[PDB]
Symmetry: C5
Subunit: 316 residues, 5 copies
């Protein structure tokens, strides 16, 4: 038999509730470039002070998940979560650990699929900046005031995340004053950058294509007298380049149409190989020295093209 | 101990309930051409006036999700939703914010998979018109009357949606009088067009095929005396075209059989390349000038074909 | 405080319950040839007469989903449903609209994955007959008697279904007397045929292969003197045919092994192309007129083969 | 107000409960070679005798799913189920039909994903023996004694199962005495064999490869004088074989690494084709009759290889 | 009517609860290299002593899943579980079997998707060490003390696990003292290694590539006089190698970018084949004995490369 002495939010009217958040990223996975999202498991720890549960004697009361519904808990929500759930492995992953002075420790295990934009302009050399924002979904700023428990180091576990492709290169936590239709709210934003592994992509596509085109333009040293050999090398290189392009197109079936960087490099290599074939034909027609078109023509143009490519994907 | 004074719909008998809807599209994703649907997360805000909850003093009562079931809430439903759920991240995403004069603000976070037809006649240059209709699923028009809170600008967040392929080019909200078996209903329709990104598809397929066929028909300037060179160019171009067609067929495994536009263009390019091969054979047979069949034959026919293609996909 | 006056099925003992069913197919999608099923969203309207809820005054009582559990509702089930759920978008999609004389209108929004056999003997020219059967799962025929409200026109919405591949060509509703172990039951069967779109498949595979083989057998008009040209055409056609076959094998990765029709046609085309190559070799050996083997040999055999193919896929 | 007279298991102490099981396989689908499982929908009928619900008068009481929780029901579980659920289409699929003498008929509609090993040593000619075991998960043998209602014919519906690939060739039901840590249990095992459709796989891979190699070794009758023709046939056959192998590798992307049978046959065909090429080179070198290496060399070795292959996949 | 005599954890204050865990892995499946996880079904048996449920007479009380919530059960959780659920096949898979002296046997059937890192540096010859850690999620070490019932042999069923690719080669159970923010905890870790099946991968890629390159470098014994034969062999081998590389790239579409071992070996084979082509051209240019570059050049370099490869993937 309880009335208004157990249901109202702490300090209902007056000073807002100071809720201190602590985060512990257990894992990050299912980062899809098609849906532009990421799945992460986090340990959401919330600490606030309530004046109505002061009990004598210094000790802790680790409550179960069944008694969580009997007390007041914050209404934190992930701002851009597309699908999420609280873990129920054997019991409910909801603990409340009350303390003598009224400190409440509310810990949850939540798997969230947050939505972050994948600006895949430079597909293999991109650092996607994805955030995990937490906000009091119902209560405005004047009612609930979110805060980070220990500044930047409140979020833990991100330094141990080594993923299939990405590596965390930076992370920082900030508190904002997000304004929307309902009113003023405090949003706790955790911002981390997912730098891709360029080394695998370099050896997968850039190194083979570079070696192929190098073999193509060093074949000009072979004299025009050996026509069938030159035709064989040209045909084999062109066919290998086409097969590589087709396989690369089929290798990653991601729904992320943003005219990527591998497309540009592959188009450059295809341009150089079929231009080498066309210039073989044109050189035969004009002869009616082939290495004069290699000593200072082809490797130099490809070097300039690579310089422009790397300048594009290096600076702004 | 409550009877009929708390369960009945507001103004039960007489003037219908004027419910004002406000929408906030958080994200749009999972747009599949196979299933012809789209997944969107929205903030459904409903505002109506109830005369039985007038409390003295100007203030707001931000209720939790547990007290939502104790009051009357509308029965809004998405007309063509295939699968949807209300978000439960930490607590229920259902708030009721009562006001002094009886205004009720009912906000929900719902992820919906609505079904919209994908008329993929022009696959890379289509603007799919997909709607998100909201209706009082049980109560007819004479009982519940839906309305947009602020006309066209009631829906927010659609201008910030940049997706993997599509870009929103238009959006407008209207109220209808949908007639069905149960009776008369008010349907709130939000109509938005998803224009595709043609630039990526142009460079992916149209530019390479155009360059290949251009190289094919400019090789007629090469004299018939260099037979092996011509056979090499023709064979390489035909093989490259076939590999490109096969890769394109395997590149997008979408279950959207509508004889698309890329199929038509690829068939045109394949027709031109194998016709070039056949005309090489026929030209040899008839010679028993090859550039006479290029100066005003092949590029001109391809130009006419491209003109017809673009006229088809430009106007009606 | 209610006993047996509110829990028992209407007319418990005596005349069975006459429940009239009305169906409204909202959408049909996710038709997979591998799992041999289809996902459909339907509006299940059930109308029966109950004598214990007669209230004075002509009017309707549109009840919510919370009061559905307080009254008796039928136990209709989809006979071959593999996975299904009732929609919960904002509230429960369960309405009961009582009337003065005891008529009860029970409407639900259900998404069902029913299992129907995909006899893919003729893969592109098949009309799969898939049913959506509804039955009183627990109560036998002597207890609950299902009926269609308005005969064939009880089911609505099927005429507006235009899908990715299939088009509805027929639909009809019937009532059966299905016999099983538990007893006698009334099953309401809705039978619809999903005719495939042959036009897309014709232009995708049949037209290119036909053009390729036509080019192959019209090359016999080219004299045997131009040996390298003939070898080039033969090699290019054979390679194109092999690539088309491989791409088609990889194009549709459906788990529906039924030796389909496209396989037969593709095998016929492959047989003709490699037979053309073999007959080139044999013709050279025997010459030691090639068009004598084309004027009345090859196109005529292919015409007979196509006649047999179309006769197989036309009649029985 | 009920105590121990309604909650205890029937015959608590003394003779164990004789529960007779009847099974009705509605469908079998989603048989994945990667996860090594199968999804099946079954009608689990359980019949036992309870002495505490004897009511006068011969009649049946078809109870709803809401009253199932008020009575005692067995704790049957599928032994190797990975994920399963009870169907809730419109109401709960749980009926209890009590009878005069205490017979209880408990019928459920359950979709189960049971795990069965896929020994894919002979991928296209395998008969996987997968079981569907049912056991009293909590109560041991001395408490609950499972039994089949009518021996082998208790399981019904398996004879009407025609699947995408497999065909049921045998089925039998047995009762065991499975021993585990908790104690002695009675396990009801339904064992069925899923024989694959070899006819589709024969025509898909074996027939084309056999025809290709036959064409390869009958080309030895062509004299060595026609060198370019022989090189053309050899190159075309080798390229076709390589493309077929690559497509087959990409055709089935199943995660079932068990060095299958199609791999062995394809390796044999690849060995024969590149050996034919190598022997062309070696025959030219040694000539410095080619059909002497065909009359009694190549088709005979391939015949011996096929004999060994079929002996391996025929007997032990 | 119960107060604090039935809700508190056993021995609340003083000696911690000694909970003995027993594990029974029913199945392991869905091991994905992309998400770096594994799905396993386990039988979690927990044994502890409670002093408040001592009943006279030696016997067992096998309680149902409905009475589990009425007693105290541990809060065990899987540390790195991404998604998990307790099985509900017919009833709840939660049994409590009390005994005379207070022993409680709590058995559950849980399907867990635990996250373990897939260090795919050596893709076909890796032994991934994945753990299944169980911990008292809420209560610290001073409150709940986890223990293995019978040391290493507490975990059962792992010896019968034969999977699609991996084979368990080792398994061991240990108890730790994991330290985190909340306090001191006892973590029960089961560590097992999943050794891959190298035999399938050897015959799939290593054997064909080795045979191809062997045929390539034994063709040097063929004299330079037979130029067209050498060009044919070289072109066929290069095309076969390129097709094999492309198919392998498309064969496994796993999102596990870690520059794997098959990539290195395939790059080595591609290097050798196109180097053989380049050296054919260079040998022709320099001749202006080819087997002098085979007797002690090519097979020896490939042997050294394979020695280095196997030394890398053998030792450290
Ligand atoms: C009963 O009490 C209610 C609460 O006190 C009253 O509701 C208020 O009604 C007034 C006008 O009638 C609202 O003022 C408007 O509010 C709009 C929405 O905030 C404003 O729009 C601006 O802000 C939005 C959100 O930022 C922008 O999207 C938009 O583009 C524009 O910039 C208007 O400019 C205007 O201020 C007020 O907000 C309402 N408050 C609430 C809490 O709903 C109601 O009128 C009372 N009724 C009676 C009969 O007295
Ligand atoms: C008990 O009270 C009930 C409610 O008052 C009575 O139900 C009504 O019964 C009459 C006929 O007995 C129904 O009239 C018909 O309704 C059909 C469905 O609306 C109409 O069909 C037309 O409309 C539908 C829907 O738009 C179209 O799909 C269809 O093609 C056609 O155009 C008929 O034309 C006809 O009007 C009436 O609708 C019923 N009302 C309800 C609410 O169910 C019932 O008869 C009473 N019983 C007794 C014994 O008195
Ligand atoms: C207590 O009361 C119960 C209900 O009144 C009694 O159950 C009945 O028991 C008799 C025999 O003891 C059953 O008769 C048999 O039923 C079989 C199943 O229906 C029949 O099999 C035939 O039909 C099935 C289903 O169509 C076919 O699959 C099968 O191949 C075959 O063709 C038998 O042929 C035979 O009739 C009767 O069905 C039971 N009824 C019910 C409702 O269970 C029970 O015996 C009573 N016990 C005592 C001790 O009196
Ligand atoms: C309180 O009462 C409890 C129940 O009466 C007592 O539990 C029993 O404790 C004894 C030993 O203390 C257990 O005996 C052992 O049980 C092991 C597990 O069954 C056996 O292992 C063998 O069997 C397992 C399972 O088949 C194999 O996996 C294993 O390899 C080996 O072959 C041992 O060999 C030995 O018998 C007994 O099982 C317990 N019974 C139960 C129901 O738990 C408890 O001791 C009592 N405590 C006190 C203080 O009196
Ligand atoms: C009310 O009672 C509460 C409980 O008794 C009090 O909370 C304690 O507050 C003190 C300081 O005010 C905390 O001490 C700090 O705790 C930090 C977190 O443990 C420590 O950080 C170190 O440990 C963490 C975790 O291992 C590391 O991540 C971190 O990098 C660093 O190494 C600090 O160093 C410091 O000890 C104490 O932990 C709090 N205890 C609990 C249970 O919350 C509260 O202050 C009381 N309030 C009043 C007004 O009296
Ligand atoms: C640490 O927090 C401060 C705010 O106190 C912020 O300015 C700073 O940027 C944070 N550190 C990093 C690395 O972002
Ligand atoms: C804005 O709303 C009006 C109705 O008041 C409608 O006519 C108009 O079309 C809307 N605007 C747009 C851009 O559609
Ligand atoms: C319409 O219903 C009748 C039964 O009254 C049935 O015989 C007929 O076949 C149905 N119409 C069609 C097109 O099937
Ligand atoms: C039928 O059941 C008997 C047991 O009574 C068993 O021996 C027999 O093998 C079963 N039939 C088949 C075909 O297995
Ligand atoms: C068995 O347990 C002991 C601890 O008592 C541990 O040291 C040992 O390593 C375990 N066995 C194996 C094979 O790991």
């Amino acid at each position: 038999t309880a009335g208004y002495n157990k249901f109202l939010r702490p300090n209902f009217g007056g000073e807002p509730v100071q809720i201190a958040l602590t985060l512990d990223i257990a894992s990050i996975s299912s980062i899809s470039e098609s849906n532009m999202d990421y799945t992460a498991t986090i340990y959401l720890r919330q600490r606030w002070m309530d004046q109505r549960l002061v009990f004598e004697g210094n000790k802790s009361f680790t409550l179960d998940a069944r008694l969580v519904e009997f007390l007041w808990v914050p209404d934190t929500y992930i701002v851009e979560s597309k699908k999420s759930f609280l873990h129920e492995v054997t019991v409910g992953n909801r603990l409340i650990r009350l303390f003598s002075n009224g400190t409440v420790l509310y810990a949850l295990r939540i798997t969230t699929t947050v939505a972050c934009n994948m600006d895949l302009s430079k597909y293999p050399m991109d650092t996607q900046t994805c955030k995990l924002q937490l906000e009091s979904w119902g209560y405005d700023g004047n009612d609930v005031e979110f805060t980070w428990l220990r500044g930047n180091d409140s979020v833990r576990g991100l330094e141990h995340l080594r993923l299939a492709q990405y590596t965390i290169e930076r992370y920082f936590t900030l508190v904002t004053r997000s304004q929307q239709e309902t009113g003023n709210y405090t949003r706790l934003v955790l911002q981390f950058e997912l730098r891709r592994n360029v080394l695998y992509f370099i050896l997968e596509t850039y190194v083979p294509s570079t070696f192929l085109v190098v073999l193509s333009w060093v074949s000009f040293w072979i004299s025009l007298d050996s026509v069938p050999a030159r035709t064989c090398i040209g045909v084999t290189t062109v066919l290998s380049m086409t097969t590589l392009m087709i396989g690369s197109r089929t290798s990653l079936p991601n729904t992320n149409c943003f005219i990527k960087a591998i497309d540009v490099y592959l188009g450059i290599c295809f341009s150089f190989v079929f231009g080498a074939l066309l210039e073989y034909a044109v050189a035969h027609y004009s002869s009616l020295n082939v290495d004069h078109y290699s000593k200072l023509l082809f490797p130099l143009i490809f070097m300039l093209a690579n310089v422009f490519y790397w300048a594009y994907y290096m600076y702004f």
